[PDB]
Design a binder for this molecule. Structure first.
Ligand code: A1AIB
Lengths: 129, 157, 36, 36
């Protein structure tokens, strides 16, 4: 130790690999021929949606981090809040309070925009295949 | 060799990636300065953010002056014929009132920073016009436009 | 009378209401993605 | 090193995993309701 815990951690990214390795062995059957192959074309759609996904989800991650918590030191932990905190405000909350009301409702039409877009790429694509 | 560097930079394909590295740079530095604390005067990273818009403003003014129509009242309406172009200028004007308020002391300084926060929510949906250059974001951005006439248009019922 | 039955009816009508709104919002786009 | 980055990567990969499973379970039935 601490090298022994590090080598075990690299084992944990091995076991996450050997299950998606099996997908090649899956395609031998009549249904997993098409089913595994469309994971390949959805792979060129699901890290490929995310160009416009980070446009809409992270923009609220930096906008909320300036209205709320306005006295943050320049550090890397602020960048950790732009992709993890928007995934964790599912239960979260002149016109000083109207500005959070507008961005929350615009987030209501934003996460519905992203969910409707992610169920848009596949609808045509399952039909000619 | 001087002809090589001249003809390389003058190509429209080359000018795309040469300015969008500056655009994604403006997006990330403006993310930086809102996280950095505010003072009476802007810092080094805030001073390059403000000058990026002021050089953009003279660039927008040469779009009116070096336009196809000749009459002055004629070269106003045709420049505002684009839905993207009309909402560009109100964001520049919101940045300007945000600069005057931020230069003043508190509580005006917090108010000017709040108008910066509605600027940064704009510059990401500004990029969607720049997205449509690719084979998939041509249709994908355009259907955001027709879903826009469906998602504040569902909300009646 | 049924003082608590009135919250029971409006809660269940809300159960078929937020399912009505979710099913309607996934209704506008289904035809529209196909001719485009 | 990034001791907390490893939970961040697996949580976000889980975000695209449970969306992958939900989108797959609403994929099997879409064609199948139409010829029936
Ligand atoms: C600051 C700041 C913003 C910005 N970007 C634009 O606002 C935009 C643009 C977007 C992406 C890449 C390149 C340019 N842009 C500014 C120059 C005039 C102009 C003309 C037509 C279309 C876009 C455009 N550059 O600096």
């Amino acid at each position: 130790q601490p090298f022994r815990s590090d080598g075990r951690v690299i084992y944990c990214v091995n076991i996450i690999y050997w299950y998606i390795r099996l997908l090649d062995i899956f395609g031998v059957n009549k249904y997993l021929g098409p089913y595994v192959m469309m994971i390949g074309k959805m792979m060129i759609d699901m890290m490929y949606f995310v160009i416009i996904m980070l446009v809409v989800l992270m923009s609220f991650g930096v906008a909320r981090q300036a209205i709320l918590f306005p006295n943050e030191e320049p550090s890397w932990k602020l960048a950790k809040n732009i992709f993890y905190m928007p995934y964790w405000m599912i239960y979260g909350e002149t016109g000083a309070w109207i500005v959070p009301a507008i961005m929350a409702c615009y987030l209501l039409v934003a996460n519905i925009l992203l969910v409707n877009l992610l169920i848009a790429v596949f609808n045509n694509t399952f039909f000619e295949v | 060799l001087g002809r090589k560097i001249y003809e390389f930079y003058n190509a429209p394909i080359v000018k795309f990636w040469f300015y969008t590295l500056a655009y994604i740079g403006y997006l990330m530095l403006f993310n930086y300065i809102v996280l950095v604390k505010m003072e009476r005067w802007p810092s080094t990273q805030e001073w390059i953010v403000i000058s990026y818009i002021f050089t953009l403003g003279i660039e927008k003014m040469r779009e009116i002056l070096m336009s196809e129509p000749g009459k002055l009242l004629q070269k106003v309406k045709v420049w505002l014929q684009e839905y993207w172009n009309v909402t560009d200028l109100i964001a520049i004007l919101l940045f300007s009132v945000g600069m005057i308020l931020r230069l003043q002391d508190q509580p005006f300084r917090s108010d000017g920073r709040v108008i910066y926060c509605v600027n940064i929510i704009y510059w990401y949906i500004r990029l969607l016009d720049i997205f449509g250059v690719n084979k998939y974001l041509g249709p994908y951005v355009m259907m955001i436009g027709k879903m826009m006439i469906d998602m504040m248009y569902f909300v009646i019922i």
